[PDB]
Paper text:
NA is an enzyme that binds and cleaves sialosides from glycans on the host cell surface to facilitate the release of nascent viral particles from infected cells, and is also proposed to assist other stages in the virus replication cycle. NA is a homotetrameric, type II integral membrane protein with a short cytoplasmic N-terminal domain. Crystal structures of NA catalytic domains, either proteolytically released from virions or produced recombinantly, have consistently shown that four identical subunits interact non-covalently to form a globular “head” with four-fold symmetry. We use homology-directed protein design to uncover the structural principles underlying these distinct tetrameric conformations and stabilize multiple recombinant NAs in the “closed” state, yielding two near-atomic resolution structures of NA by cryo-EM.
N1-CA09-sNAp-155, which reverted an extra mutation at the surface-exposed position 453 of N1-CA09-sNAp-130, maintained closure with the similar yield to N1-CA09-WT and had its stabilizing mutations maximally buried to maintain proper antigenicity. Relative to N1-CA09-WT, N1-CA09-sNAp-155 features four mutations in space A, three in space B (on the underside of NA distal to the C4 axis), and three in space D. sNAp-130 and sNAp-155 were henceforth used interchangeably as representative sNAps for N1 CA09. We found that the tetramer-stabilizing mutations in N1-CA09-sNAp-155 increased the Tm by 9.5 and 19.1 °C in the presence of CaCl2 and EDTA, respectively, when compared to N1-CA09-WT. To better understand the roles of our stabilizing mutations, we determined a cryo-EM structure of N1-CA09-sNAp-155 at 3.2 Å resolution. 2D class averages obtained from samples that were purified and vitrified in the absence of supplemental Ca2+ exclusively showed closed NA tetramers resembling those observed in crystal structures, in contrast to our earlier cryo-EM 2D class averages of N1-CA09-WT. The 3D reconstruction of N1-CA09-sNAp-155 confirmed its adoption of the closed tetramer in solution. The main differences were in a few solvent-exposed loops that were poorly ordered in N1-CA09-sNAp-155, including the C-terminal region from residues 458–469, the ‘150-loop’ consisting of residues 145–150, and the ‘430-loop’ consisting of residues 429–437. Additionally, a backbone segment adjacent to the space A mutations was slightly rearranged such that W455 packed closely against the introduced mutations and W457 moved away from its native position at the interface. For example, P99 and T196 (T195 in N2 numbering) in space A form a central hydrophobic contact across the interface that closely matches the same interaction seen in the NA structures used for homology-directed design. Likewise, I177 (I176 in N2 numbering) provides additional hydrophobic packing in both N1-CA09-sNAp-155 and the NAs of other subtypes relative to N1 CA09, while I205 adds further hydrophobic packing that was favored by Rosetta.
Numbering used by the authors:
A (entry chain C), B (entry chain B), C (entry chain A), D (entry chain D): 83 to 142, 151 to 319, 334 to 338, 345 to 428, 438 to 457
The structure:
């Protein structure tokens, strides 16, 4: 049965641990893959962890030999249980309630091609349009009403690039618009469904200490801006969750360095520029080194609830480190020091 | 289909071997986890072995990095086939006939939080109430009428602590009472269903050479006392099985040391203080070293019987050793020397 | 659906390779168990290989620590994919069309107990009756009409022992007779169903260069004698297949040594003492060393045929060697030199 | 549900990557089999990779000990997840929509026998007819209307051999014709279904720099000739795809050496001898070394389409190298340099 995604995002007062991936103590003598920036996506039956690898084992990069593989959430990414998904140096994935959609980018940095697979079968492709490193989300893609959306970027990492939003049905591209977003930069977008709309929070690698966002409907009509908590432009992939005018911001404790990770609830942060917030919870302590982060969601079809549960993953730098994921609850929680 | 648990416990005249877990001869060159105190719980389809580990392999502790994992009963606890359940330094688990319920305690010894998962999804949480090492059963939780109960302790290991009984439905806490049990100590409780009631036998680490018990109904009304075989207070986790006024006691042969393991049937031991018994069977010989023990059960939905079959596991110290489990029969059996 | 077993055994003019088990070239660096005398039994869905092991890996005996494990036919017997069945130093197994029946013998040589499991659950037991090494078939048990039979021996390996035939339904012993067979010896019996009867060919370790057999019905009425091809008494486990008065005999080429293996069709060999035969096929060459052999069958429920297909396994000594299995066809075949 | 195969082959304007098999970087410390010339075949649910091996692991040939094994496409061919199919030094396989058909050749070079299995059961056999190295396709067999066809060769590799086409239903040979094809040589035939006909393109190892083909119906009526792109005779296994009078030819870039791999669309190449073509795409660059190649297809029952999708695999020499497979699309693609 196809995912609906017409319900609202669940109100969460706190965040609690879900799983720990990329364990390295097991890797000391065990056959385990050397992976970086794993991402999590969920089906109606189970959650899975996706990663890119060249097959390099520990105790033993745009590459045509680099592939996307996956294991059940919390499992060890070993060559003996990882499933093969696609060939890609940049990739994203999601489940539409029927099967898995996998989007992978392979080929030369001057003529890259994205190969779209549905249930293991190649269904479509999309070739570079500005000929300069085609790249995708490196996260879960959002699905609403059996269709799964995504945001792709082609162009310079330090300048004005072209951005395109794609609606994909059963592996095929049915609609696609080009964004008019001058002076915005949208790399590594973290997207989630909310009441039959798609909301994405992206990484500005050009001139934005704050994070840009794009919001769009199934027809691909869109709005843009920055999280005001300046509303204009003022990096590492991140995320946030919209609740009316309030926003849950995932960020480091330090500004100049990668230290700590905390989740702040700013009830007027979507539209206001004030620094006020109501509550805060420590996810990662100041001594640890925080790194890449992104969101994923658990749909009603999986949780048995009448709303969508917001979750997220933080990769701790330590080097590779570990990818710890957490999920949102409305019950009591404490700060966490890993 | 949800488990009923309304039938009585099966009368057993003897105990016969079921499986051997934590094998170490296989571990000499094989990638196997270093585990301690594994516990067994059964679903309607299969029995599984649960353990806590940091990912340390052999031939290579309250920790936020310590996790709960599981393998099919009798299988090798390797990184290539263990399933991930939760993040916890103390944990329990059971199946309600529909899905798995996993209860894990993580966080700081001064503010621990128990995370309750149902079918892999976080459904609820319960924060420490006396702020002193929240800890659970380290065994199977009991289920009756689709609801699964448990007993949690918060407080000193050598003094008067607070004890709370929790009724959990589909991962959520629907009811919870605090026990009034002055001069009792209830750690590591081993619980089983019997005719729509829950009976638990616990470890008194304070001032009880005998074992305290608590018995309660679905509504959480309860009675307490000691196994009289003194009825008041006179350690290592253990178990016993109630049959009217008779009790099957799992204990060591020696008193001052951990030597041997035997099962004694005292037909008046629940309420009497006499040392008389009718029958006895050796499970483990005097030379071997016995250690932690606990019970688990096999429901009619799994066995095809019209009663609940009592089983149990003994960890042999040897160090880690091996966790051998046995099940109750009404057929001929012999003593066992491992 | 339960197996019927009311059809006749399929007429075979030849034998063709099925699978190769116990590979050792893979074991040179791979984690593989050290096993001896593996046996094959089939379910309606798949065939599986069973073996006993202490967990000893290569490149690293009546024992309470020795267990019975299994892998899909042709698969490598590694600790990462072997399933646990039971604890035993002597064992047999078969499928009744619904679930697996496993019979394992454990305990002391002076008071051994056989533990009968059905679908992983202990259902019954049978204690030694002459107190001298209880031992079973080390092969597949036969099933006819949802019930599975077996032949067990208790007594000296070089003298007159007691033999008992057991009919088992869903793991429980419903009927059991003691054989009156003076001057016969029946160890390691290889049994198969044929038209709602059970036929077993056993190893005489006392005073029979030929092989004794027992034939019995569901009610356990029986006949005994030797394969005449003397009809009375004149070792290593073996087998034969009855077709009217003709018999297919699996034997070595040499008499005084373990060299070669051949299958001979003697159309009057069941009842005649003549040395005449019609056809012969080489399975194993003279240079190789043959060893233990036994039979198993593939039922109509698995093959899609209107008869039961006779198969067999030969362990080549080489030491452990390899266990090669073959199946009967009515099509052209050649001799085989491994 | 049985495969129909009555639809036409899908028109493809380009070829895009599907999977990478035989990875060796993983093999540096991992337990992985040493394999050569793996082939791909697809079922209605999944695609699988087949290979022959003696069990030799890396970091550790007609042989009765050599077997055919398989893993999911893109998975590592390790001893811990490879499935056993048959015993053979030459083999082919395909799925008929119900189960797997496996054809393996074993036995002596002077009296080889092909063993046909269906769903793991031996169903039939075919003995050598010219007594000189019986050999099969080393690829996927074609299936149309629940029946699966194949082409087998018996005779010299440098002269006139006998060729026979076999129609197999549920593992049994129902029809078989001998080809009259003087001065033709047909080894390692790559076959695919197209509109209820079977088309095969073979390797002429005798005196043909071009490739011979045979085309036949379910009744086994056939036509022969060469791909004209001379129509008569003018090596390494290869393939081509027929689209009316046009042909998609898989070949190396160099003539005298194994360098590069490209796919050329010659709209009149089936029947014309001209060197003209409309389009060309690079699969493998000139520096790399190309080697064995063959075709396989993805049926409507798997893809959800109303036509059959043509795919193919190229083994890159590097030694073993890697087996990269591609599939046909009608969307934009680029050249590939591995
Ligand atoms: C989503 O759509 C389903 C019908 O497919 C409906 O039953 C459900 O109530 C809708 N939920 C919301 C929040 O609109
Ligand atoms: C969802 O898609 C269906 C067609 O499958 C359409 O009829 C319906 O209007 C859509 N609903 C929304 C909320 O877009
Ligand atoms: C338990 O409840 C079921 C109904 O769900 C009933 O059929 C069964 O007899 C009851 N067993 C006992 C011991 O009360
Ligand atoms: C079991 O729960 C059901 C509701 O699901 C309730 O109606 C019934 O009375 C309960 N029975 C017992 C024995 O508690
Ligand atoms: C075996 O019994 C079944 C009924 O369960 C019957 O249909 C079949 O014909 C019988 N076969 C023989 C050989 O008697
Ligand atoms: C098989 O068992 C059934 C009962 O399940 C019985 O009615 C029938 O007579 C038996 N048939 C044979 C051939 O023993
Ligand atoms: C193939 O046969 C099926 C019936 O089994 C039919 O529905 C389908 O249209 C046919 N396709 C072609 C191309 O003839
Ligand atoms: C396919 O086989 C069926 C019988 O299963 C037959 O009736 C039909 O005519 C065949 N069709 C073709 C296209 O050969």
């Amino acid at each position: 049965v196809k995912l609906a995604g017409n319900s609202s995002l669940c109100p969460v007062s706190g965040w609690a641990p879900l799983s720990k991936d990329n364990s390295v103590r097991i890797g000391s003598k065990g056959d385990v893959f050397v992976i970086r920036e794993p991402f999590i996506s969920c089906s109606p039956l189970e959650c899975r962890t996706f990663f890119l690898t060249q097959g390099a084992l520990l105790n033993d990069d745009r590459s045509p030999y680099r592939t996307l593989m996956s294991v059940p959430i919390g499992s060890v990414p070993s060559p003996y249980n990882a499933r093969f998904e696609s060939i890609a140096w940049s990739a994203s994935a999601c489940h539409d309630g029927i099967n898995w959609l996998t989007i992978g980018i392979t080929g030369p940095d001057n003529g890259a091609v994205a190969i779209l697979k549905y249930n293991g079968i190649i269904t479509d492709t999309i070739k570079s349009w500005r000929n300069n490193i085609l790249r995708t989300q490196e996260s879960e893609c959002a699905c609403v009403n059996g269709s799964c959306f995504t945001v792709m970027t082609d162009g310079p990492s330090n300048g004005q690039a072209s951005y395109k939003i794609f609606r994909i049905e059963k592996g095929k591209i049915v609609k696609s618009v080009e964004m008019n977003a001058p002076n915005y930069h949208y790399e590594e977008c973290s997207c989630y469904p909310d009441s039959s709309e798609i909301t994405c929070v992206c990484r500005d690698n050009w001139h934005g200490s704050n994070r840009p966002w794009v919001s769009f409907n199934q027809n691909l009509e869109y709005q843009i801006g920055y999280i005001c908590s300046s509303c204009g432009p003022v990096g590492v992939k991140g995320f946030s969750f919209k609740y009316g005018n309030g926003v849950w911001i995932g960020r480091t404790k330090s500004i100049s360095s990668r230290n700590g990770f905390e989740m702040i609830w700013d009830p007027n942060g979507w539209t206001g520029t004030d620094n006020n917030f109501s509550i805060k919870q420590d996810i990662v302590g100041i001594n640890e080194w925080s790194g890449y982060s992104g969101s994923f969601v658990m749909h009603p079809e999986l949780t048995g609830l009448d709303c969508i549960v917001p979750c997220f993953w933080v990769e701790l730098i330590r080097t590779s480190g570990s990818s710890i994921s957490f999920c949102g609850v409305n019950s009591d929680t404490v700060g966490w020091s890993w």
